[model samples]
Target: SRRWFHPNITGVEAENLLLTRGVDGSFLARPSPGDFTLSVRRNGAVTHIKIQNTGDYYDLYGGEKFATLAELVQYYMEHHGQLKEVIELKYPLNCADPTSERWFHGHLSGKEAEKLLTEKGKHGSFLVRESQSHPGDFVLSVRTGDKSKVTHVMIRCQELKYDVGGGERFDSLTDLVEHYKKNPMVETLGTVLQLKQPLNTTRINAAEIESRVRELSKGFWEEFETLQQQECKLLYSRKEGQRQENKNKNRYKNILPSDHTRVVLHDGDPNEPVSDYINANIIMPEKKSYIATQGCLQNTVNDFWRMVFQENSRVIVMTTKEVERGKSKCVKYWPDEYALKEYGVMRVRNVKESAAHDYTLRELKLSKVGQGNTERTVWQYHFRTWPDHGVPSDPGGVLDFLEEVHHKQESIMDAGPVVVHCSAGIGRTGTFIVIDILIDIIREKGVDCDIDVPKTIQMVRSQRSGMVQTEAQYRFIYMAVQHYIETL
Candidate 1:
């Protein structure tokens, strides 16, 4: 049975669980005198709707009938307005039985498990997920000897023990899987099903990020350590930033942009060697594109402006102060209020400046030196609350800051990618970029869509290097995502 099927719980217990752990649209199913009942929480109150079973089929009273309870629940979940008694069943209040192991993907249907295993798994790879038809049972999908073929075996849970029918029973799912990994199971047709590799999943429903954050908080260091260890495997080439002519333009000696996705300045002088080189990488998350670069060095400031004008970027996100802890982080790239500065062929004028609770906003006008009629407006959001060594105490302020930044970016028509930077451009720059990307995804794909934070970080790091730099910063991403989900 799936986790939502509470066979042993009563109506009162169902109401208690829904009211405490669920939101307005959360729901669960429990056994009742009339076969079963669906308990839902809406607007801070619990509503119980009865389900009638006619021995051969199940239905919510007299409309559409289904062969199983799972189908009936799934139908109502998809067609929300069809249910006469309740408004909707947005989230299922899963029972606390499945272990937090990455192998166990709760609520995954058989077709999804089969598709995932065939597409990403090898011959001996396997994964476990909930059974859609049987409600309280689980399915183990394994790729067979034929690379394209996948076989599913049922793992039943009875009397608080787990077993693969007619085999040895175990106390927990992990123990059962461990035993099977050492002793291969043989099918009735003499096919050997070896559990050589266990597939891991980091994807989770976007709305459930709060519980995931709570679970991750217990072992943040362990998770971060595993992520850190995997960094050695993602080393891409940085040969473009290794040239002698471009050596002095880098803020840090070791930090360089990847060769494949680095942004190049278009208007550099042809006589100079490595004239187009700049220490910046292009990061794209979903449909949005962002340029992640280091803070402006004294020598590369001209290259920065040239690249900005060439790419037609309308917004800039600076996640650091010009100076931090008595050290120079970034050079003063913009002129003072009502002042003008020239970098290469591009001219910049500071038009306006404003201060928010945690950041500063600057409106700058850009124009070519000779072409006075062609001009553009650029907005820079300078975040100032981040400390020099650690993350912010709370993530609410950072999320609010991103909301305003997104508002400004969307308001502009035909605007280019938003350029983002920190000191080294990998630490806090990655954090802010990731938070904004995930929030955009959640808003577009709905809160129930699957999201993988570690995978997203790995993707960004592939474009640049060493994104989500610190353990605290890694944890803060979860906090920021959780905060966004709560507001929704």
Candidate 2:
């Protein structure tokens, strides 16, 4: 029997299993007299649908007939409205526990596992799943040589020990996997199967975030350290920012933007060598876009306004104070209330100002100096509460500030990408951008959708160097996502 099929469990035992370990839409199959039964959980109630097994074919007594019982289950799982009660078979509840590793996918069929490995994995990538035919045993699925082919190795569990076959026996699946990684296995055709990499799962149930948070806390520092080591491997060229002519315009000499995704000024003189250069990078995480730039230097303020005007950016986020610890961190670039200032060809007037508990909000009227009176409004959110050294003591304030920023951004139509900066623009700037991006993803796909915090940071860093600079910031991202899930 397959992993989902239980031969001896009664109706009461099925109800107990679904109620305790399964969510709504979780289901399993069991034997019933001379036929079979499909037990599904819906809104805290159990529904058992009789499946006819007439030896020639299998059906639900009214719907289309399937050649095998697995086909009947698969057809109903794919097509929804053919059933009488509109049952949605979502998660399958496995009857046994093999391992708790992220690569161990329970109840995954051979074909589905092969598709996943071929599409999402590379050579030597591997995963473990429950054997479809043998209920208590497991199968190790690996992508072998030629990069497109796959190999499935059966792992038998007998007397509380696991082994591939007549070879070495291990006390746990983790130990068995570790042993096999050191020693490769050979197929019948002499093709070598290696377990070089394990494709970890990122998707998790929405309600289980608290448990995830607890699990991640144990290895927070280790994970952050690993991410730090990977930073040197993602080096991209920053030749534009490194040029001698544009070196003085940068707030920090070493921290520069990648040349490929850097924001170039359209209004700069074509003959000038460094006129189009700016210390900014365009970061696109998923679909939403952002400009991560350095804080305005005294000499680069004109170029900053040029970037804002050229890109048509409507929202600006500042995460550091102009003066911190009696040192000038950033130059003040905006005009006083009711005062107008001109930078290059762009003119900016401070229209209104308000102060929140943790940030200051400013509405600025922007227009070209000689291009008529056509004006556009730009909103600046100055988050002044971030400490000079480490992360914030609480994540709730940062979340609230982002919520207000998003509300304003959504209200506008045809707005450009948001501009975000701090002193160096890689620490706090990256943190804020990553948090907002993850929040948007959760909102669009629901909390049940998968999220990879470290991977998202890596994607952002690909556009700009040293985003999410510290281990504390890395840990803070997990805290922010955890706090957000609690709110839902």
Candidate 3:
């Protein structure tokens, strides 16, 4: 049986951790990206091997112990001189029965054996061009007696006898072995990775052991994603009777428990639009190809360009917890390569945006400003990013920043809308958009803007659980808006 393990080394002796080792090998296991295996032949020869997603690395012992699989495989292939020979290898488990997986095994071609041993035709994955390192006996596994003694077992290809089945062909493994023994050079046997067969454990598929591998693969991106999902649920979930909170002194209508459903972006129907605002009746084209999140340039910049530049001009700006995590001044400036390729950019370099009077969000570290613009009058706050959504919300900070900005700029009233973005492009962006809409509504109306901030926020969330993903950001926006109002 072919015993398999993960590759702890790379092509240059660098390791290929966090990759599948024996996915295609006869043996498979879900070890956390670092593993290997050693096998000894009955003849006392040792074979050390490792497999990563792309390469199978090994080392062979010419009657010696190997410190590394790479050295062993390299030494064997170079000295033994085995070149290339295609061989049919056996596999683990019965092909017909799923539960028949006991172990994996393989047989070499006896005909090709002598030639391989003598170097007529050589075979193995690692090719050692140096006349010094060629290898031969692919002694994958060997038997050993544990009592301080090593015995040589000649496990080479040989002819044998067998009985034919009733109205069938070949009979015994010995016969099969002997039949191919004479050819001496007819190649047979191969090395390939094997995938794990399906099991009952994978049935529910909601949360897979592999998918939820934060316990093992700590600091991986998926872990953060999972955290965000959980945090969002908690943040958005309404608490028991504290009075319905809303923007503009009005409460939002909650989603009916019956209507709580989920949908993937591209799964259900591609052409069918999931856009809440746009309906089929309008016959409007959907530019539904927006890839989210990048460093620096966040929302306002992109939205400003989109509004000023793009057609049918509708842009959504929001912030994110990650973006804001000490990156308050970290603004996303321009569209990315993909965006540039898809949509042309407007010639305009800089434009300004209105600041909300209530929030205390300011003191951003400005670095890269619009080209040729030195004064606050010349540039717009193209992007607005907050710290992580997990950080305590600061409506006071935002309002403070807005007042400061407005106080500094004489043309505050003439600026265009800003864009906001965070990592996922949902929560933070929605925060900026909803709050701005609410503030604008209050301005349009008097003290009783009676704006449905919650409902509107809910509307965005209903389309996509956006702003206030967690209890903190959610409450921050609500309390923050109220705090700004009181300050005003």
Candidate 4:
């Protein structure tokens, strides 16, 4: 059997915090363009180690040597006591199951309970059902610590998980929650963060707990629209439909990058300017690491390439297929051997193509028109497993696909931002970017980097609007991030 506790230090969140420590690790600083650097003493001297966004991975000795950050910390702790002195190595979690959700432990108001069930309570459809025999009596399903079996409880008021298995009784939801919270048949885990996972509670690092969930859970959508997501639709293009093929398909009505961040195309004609309204935003803990946008419509294909060229984006991550179910999700943006096409000064050449189980990889050479023109290679990662409006049945396939994308980008030096998009550019698009960003955060800041999924979505949406559009997609972000951390 696996150990009930994996020496808390081994956890991704815990490991990341350790990696940011001394001697071979320097102080916190934006040491690189897209990664954090910690200058640490090595061989009687000092060297800055580059910790990439993914929590465990790092490049030491001037990026010539690559190793898991955990290995680096572990080695220093045993051999270099001085390094440990700079930042004390300690357990991040006191409880065995900090990652599990304490459904009965969180503070939930009536409206908050309604929303949690509606938005997050989907796994078992455990709703706030009313008792059949009593008025104003609440009855609901509670997990019995067995994955296979769940029990029901009747609550007149609230507090306490006092007991349970075959069937338990409680006076109120508050009582039931308090019962398990205080003492129980088994360990009571912490609650999940607003936008992601790894429950937040006292047993875990105090600095890592996210208290924003309850505040965020109230008027969530309204909070997202005003304070977080924002509006960006027609900030750049005012040409009716704002150059969108389907007006209804646009996720956020008024979400667009500010004048400074919008990608503008030089059309030679000053009056009739061309702007796809594509957003060039920076993912936290990195540079202009991502460009979130919608799938290319027929009319916007040229503009898409222009934005690609402007941003120098070399990797295109397409989560939606060209067609899904029956509708057109995206256009064929690149050319084949027989169809070399020109979009203004840009020319595209199909270099190579390969097919796989979950994704299709294409190598295309992009060029500026005229002889001796500038050229660059672009890699297109087209994921085919994710559903149009729903998430993948299993995240394994998508996770594998994501790993491949990361490896490919890493192999290339000075690679520009990775352009990610879906149909509306917010659902799966947001999911991928969120997962990717969180992984890097964990690798750098640790699994307990206080990942505010809502804040993350807010940041992305603030740039492209309507990111991680659906509540289901929001939940999927947590699922994907959790799976990645568990593997690490």
Model 3, position 36: C-alpha lDDT score? 34
Q: lDDT (CA) for every model shown?
A: 0.79, 0.79, 0.29, 0.52
Number of clashes in model 4?
35
Candidate that beats the other on TM-score, 1 or 4, i.e. the better one: 1
Worst 10 residues of 1 by lDDT: 53-62
**For each candidate, what TM-score against the reference?**
0.64, 0.65, 0.29, 0.50
By TM-score, the candidates rank as 2, 1, 4, 3
Query: lDDT (0-100) at residue 81 of candidate 4?
Result: 45
Candidate 3 C-alpha lDDT tens digits along 87-162? 1111221111101111112233333333232332112111101111212221111112222211111222223212
Per-residue lDDT of candidate 4, residues 51-122 (tens digit) = 452211133443322222333343343443434314422222122221122333333345544454444343
RMSD of 4: 21.7
Runs of candidate 2 exceeding 4 Å displacement: 1-124, 127-186, 192-197, 201-206
Question: For residue 426, what is the lDDT in candidate 1?
Answer: 80
Candidate 2 similarity to native, TM-score: 0.65
